[PDB]
């Protein structure tokens, strides 16, 4: 009977080995990422408009062909399984009934194919492998299964020092495997190959620069996900909330613009979308949710932010996503 | 015998219930908004003047139609039979006395004409029903029983999500009642539904975006007030005190401009003058001058806000409350 | 055998009445002002140069006609009796053995004649009385007896609201008194009547905006003293430092622009001295001196004060104050 | 096995006397230059760029004529000797075997022709003798040694306020000594006299102000050190990261800029690279190392900084020192 995100973190603390918290809460280097995630968000207000006409207000959006009941998905989290045995498929079923876009990681521990017979028409996250064709047969692998996206993580030549995971010498338990299995960096040139062997959209995940963005939109990526993959990546990375007002305005609708880090309400995601975000990832809340009650979790949490998102639009006098990206914000302190 | 607001919260905690004491302090969501009230009102520094002539300081003001003998009136809170036996009647009383305007609520636990019986010119409190035709009957009681505005509540389409009020299950005791009665989203068209029914001046409460202040001129509006509802309404809404001086610059004089939330002293007024203000509303603390002591409580509270108002002009030069307005302010750090 | 202003802080709390050090220690309202001294110089660092010549360090300015050892004067603080039995008289002797202004208060427990015989050439702190003739009479007084500046008070039309003396019911003692006797708001005209009875340096004490200290070269002031009265008076009136800078500019050099509030160290006077000051007052810090060790204690105080105005400024790579008014600084945080 | 460069300052406190751990840690005065080198870089984000080419990731810059490992060198650090027995000649091994720049001290407690015995083309630091020929000899001796730059300190006119060691009456054990012997100000007609004296470059450390970095190009100058001396000279000294952009842009490729204090990881290194910054240098974390470890503790505390180093690069999309000096960055908050 969770009434916000923070009673799911306690309740997952409660019930998960402390190393494997840890795997999940953690970020790189001094975790100065990660905290600025939540200190980029806290400063930003929103100036709410009132008096408008709410007698319809819809939180939908339409993204990369689908209509989406929320502008929100679940972030690429790999190896659900260490936090709840039906791991992976527990989340898309939730996700599935939400109308919440699911992304299926290329590190899942339970098979691509299996979790997209859950249905809910899933996205398909990327890593690039030390071979082009094992990278284009995930890519086919997932396209042939339904996934309607493939986001392409670009922010992973290799993965940060996370040392809380050197500390407690954490090491995937022997039943969690990589379920997709029986790496190398990332170039535009990989992007150029993936674009060249699907029509589905391709998300840039991990853009930060500008002419990042703006070099994805000429790449012909369909969306980009403005992320320091959580704060696990480089330490000392700006958080992509600080950038998103610039990447948006850089783009200038050239292809969706979606941001993650830090979202933890209702409210956080009216911040990303007054800011211009086309819709937010969700990572670790979701997995809180998963390890404190599997699937029936996942959806209490998905009705939470549901609840949140529009009692957040509506007082803020905005009837519909697109109105809600036209809000202006005030930058205050702490 | 207090000597500051704070005194009369920390008896008031004594008194109160928990979840009654929850019911007042609390705000919405993580309350970011109540707290970045506090931050916002802290971080004005007042440039005093000297030598100015100082042998007549007056505090009064006029606003609708009436003296005030403070720029101060007293918020419209909800069910004052909650923190007091009194509720209502004691408040109204000692604002009377003090010559503060008291503002009646539509859901006040004493029906508003017994509090308009008082004396004291009050004002009243609507929150836009279900059916214009209702609304706009407790208009025309209000009008018939003395009132002499209508504070519109404008940034109501709903309540917001109190977790403090549910994470207690708190619920009206039946001794409380809505005594006005034996809810829908306003617009612009209730607005001038309301104007059209009254000659009284309305006034608009929670505005905090430059364009409505601006509509609301145009639409005929007396005043308005900048506020964000305490906190309670959307968390992570502006300050309205961080939007007062760009919203003063925009009416350029077409109607007066109230604003709210954490007043806290007569220095606090002081700054919302010098930022623009026609006058504050105090909201939370006449209602623990109520729970502490009843109609002496609130008397006492006023005696005390109106010495550190008349105090913190005389010290920064100002006679009267016009010359307040025309102080200058400097942004500090914490 | 101290090395720092805040061991003798500690030894003044240890032997003074609670009741006495609050008086000391304290500001008005909720001492925003008090802490905002410390804030605001603590934000400020110095831009130091290196390698020049430091083969004569001098820290001796020359202001209202007499060379003074430190860009540093004591400033007035009432009743010293309540700190030590020699009061007053303790502390002029140090201050006149360093070669450093002492201000008589008028409000001294020694008679402004028995502490200009202490010799020392010290200023007199002027508080505008309820008859213009008595005021004048002080005035004159303080000449006759070798006081070399009139220091008027003009941001005390009357005391603050100082909650620490209001709660602990403080009242002096019967054993200290205002020894120069056996109040009224000052204006222009109280300054413009100091200056027609004396010809001595008229010195305006507590502007804090930029048009008042215009005003004050106008009204033919040789300095002003740009203060909030260590935070004793306006609560919420924004620091000297604050204002110093944007006043320096605006005198452009026709007076002497002196600072005070919250200077702890010979660090502190050499940032206000990079941010154009001629001199700065230091106050409690004198008084904690005193209370520790009568006038050897104030004596040690300038002694430390000295070597730390000097190491400052040389390792800063200035030979001279008028040097130090030409560094640079730089808004930090925290 | 540490991960960090925290294990290390902890393993030290452990083992060394409370005296020499204060007297490595503290800085002048109340300790804010100190905290504000730690700050400064905290608030510096980076902007990192994603798919370029990292097919071989190169950390080597080269500087003075040398090709170096890392974009490092280890400060200046006196008295070695008081953290490990083998003092100087445990820091020049490791710092050899790292293939980093090691910076011999006029005080160090080893002789410097014993240090550059060691190899690894060390830097040689001087202090300004009281007489030019002594200084000079320094000069000549740390030539004929193969010293390959002579670090001016320039920011040290005389030693800081350091009130740890005075509160603890530090002084050197008998034990320890300044090997090199059996002070005056510098001028620029002391960086003139060494620059005639020696065809090796001179670089000059503790650089803050723009127009000294100007001269010291126009002196002939081979580098600078952006430094404030660990906040150990003037107590609020502006910190050397938050001038370095400035100074990057005046000298405009004139001589080599350092930077240091507070650098404490591999992604503060990148911070100072991203701002423009040839190399740093680093000195408290390689006291801790040489005290928790001696020769074994430094060489892996310089792994730990090289994997750090090239982990940060690599996230941030650099290939090479220079690719990192061109990102960009963004001032955050906390
Ligand atoms: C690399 C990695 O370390 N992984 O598993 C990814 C991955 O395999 N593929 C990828 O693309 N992203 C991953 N993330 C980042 C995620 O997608 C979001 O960017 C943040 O979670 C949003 O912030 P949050 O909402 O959590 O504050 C992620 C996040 C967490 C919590 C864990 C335990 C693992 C990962
Ligand atoms: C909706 C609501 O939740 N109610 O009862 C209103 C309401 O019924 N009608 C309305 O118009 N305003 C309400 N307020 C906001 C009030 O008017 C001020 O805006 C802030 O109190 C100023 O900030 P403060 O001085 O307290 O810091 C309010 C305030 C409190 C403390 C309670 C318990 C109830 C309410
Ligand atoms: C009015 C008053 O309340 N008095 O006694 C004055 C006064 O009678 N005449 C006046 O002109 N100033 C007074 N001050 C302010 C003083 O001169 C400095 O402005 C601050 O002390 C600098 O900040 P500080 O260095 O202390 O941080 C002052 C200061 C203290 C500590 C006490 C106990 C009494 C007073
Ligand atoms: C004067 C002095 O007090 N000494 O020994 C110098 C010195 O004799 N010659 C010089 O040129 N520099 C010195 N430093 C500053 C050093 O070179 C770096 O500037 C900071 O250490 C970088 O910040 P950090 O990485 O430590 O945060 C220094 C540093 C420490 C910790 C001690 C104990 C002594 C010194
Ligand atoms: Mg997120
Ligand atoms: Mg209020
Ligand atoms: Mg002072
Ligand atoms: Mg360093």
């Known amino acids: 009977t969770y009434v916000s995100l923070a009673d799911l973190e306690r309740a997952a603390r409660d019930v998960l080995p402390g190393?494997?918290?840890d795997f999940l809460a953690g970020g790189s280097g001094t975790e100065a990422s990660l905290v600025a995630n939540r200190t980029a968000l806290e400063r930003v207000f929103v100036i709410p408009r009132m008096?408008?006409?709410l007698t319809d207000v819809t939180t939908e959006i339409d993204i990369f062909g689908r209509r989406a009941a929320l502008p929100m998905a679940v972030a690429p989290v790999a190896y659900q399984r260490l936090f709840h045995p039906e791991g992976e498929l527990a989340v898309a079923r939730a996700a599935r009934d939400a109308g919440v876009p699911y992304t299926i990681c290329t590190l899942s521990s339970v098979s691509l194919?299996?979790?997209?017979?859950?249905?809910?028409?899933?996205?398909?996250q990327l890593y690039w492998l030390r071979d082009e064709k094992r990278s284009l047969d995930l890519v086919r692998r997932a396209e042939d299964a339904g996934c309607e996206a493939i986001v392409f993580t670009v922010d992973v030549p290799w993965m940060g020092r996370r040392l809380?995971?050197?500390r407690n010498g954490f090491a995937l338990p022997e039943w969690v495997t990589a379920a997709?299995?029986?790496?190398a960096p990332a170039t535009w040139?990989?992007?150029?190959?993936?674009?060249?062997?699907?029509?589905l959209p391709v998300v840039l995940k991990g853009i930060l620069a500008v002419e990042d963005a703006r070099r994805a939109v000429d790449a012909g990526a369909g969306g980009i996900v403005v992320s320091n993959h959580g704060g696990r990546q480089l330490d000392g990375a700006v958080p992509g909330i600080e950038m998103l007002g610039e990447i948006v305005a850089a783009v200038s609708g050239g292809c969706?613009?979606?941001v993650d880090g830090g979202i933890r309400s209702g409210g956080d995601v009216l911040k990303a979308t007054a800011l211009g975000?086309?819709?937010?990832?969700?990572?670790?809340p979701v997995m809180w949710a998963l390890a404190a009650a599997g699937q029936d979790g996942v959806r209490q949490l998905l009705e939470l932010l549901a609840e949140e998102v529009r009692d957040a639009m509506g007082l803020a006098g905005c009837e519909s996503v697109g109105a809600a990206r036209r809000l202006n914000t005030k930058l205050g302190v702490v």
């Not at 194919?113 to 398909?124: D, K, L, N, S, T």
């Not at 040139?189 to 029509?199: K, L, M, P, Q």
């Not at 975000?277 to 990572?283: H, K, P, Q, R």
């Open 19 to 21: 190393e494997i918290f």
């Open 51 to 53: 008096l408008r006409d």
């Open 113 to 124: 194919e299996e979790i997209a017979a859950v249905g809910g028409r899933p996205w398909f």
């Open 164 to 166: 809380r995971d050197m």
């Open 180 to 183: 997709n299995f029986d790496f």
């Open 189 to 199: 040139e990989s992007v150029e190959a993936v674009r060249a062997h699907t029509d």
């Open 256 to 258: 969706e613009v979606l």
């Open 277 to 284: 975000a086309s819709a937010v990832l969700v990572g670790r």
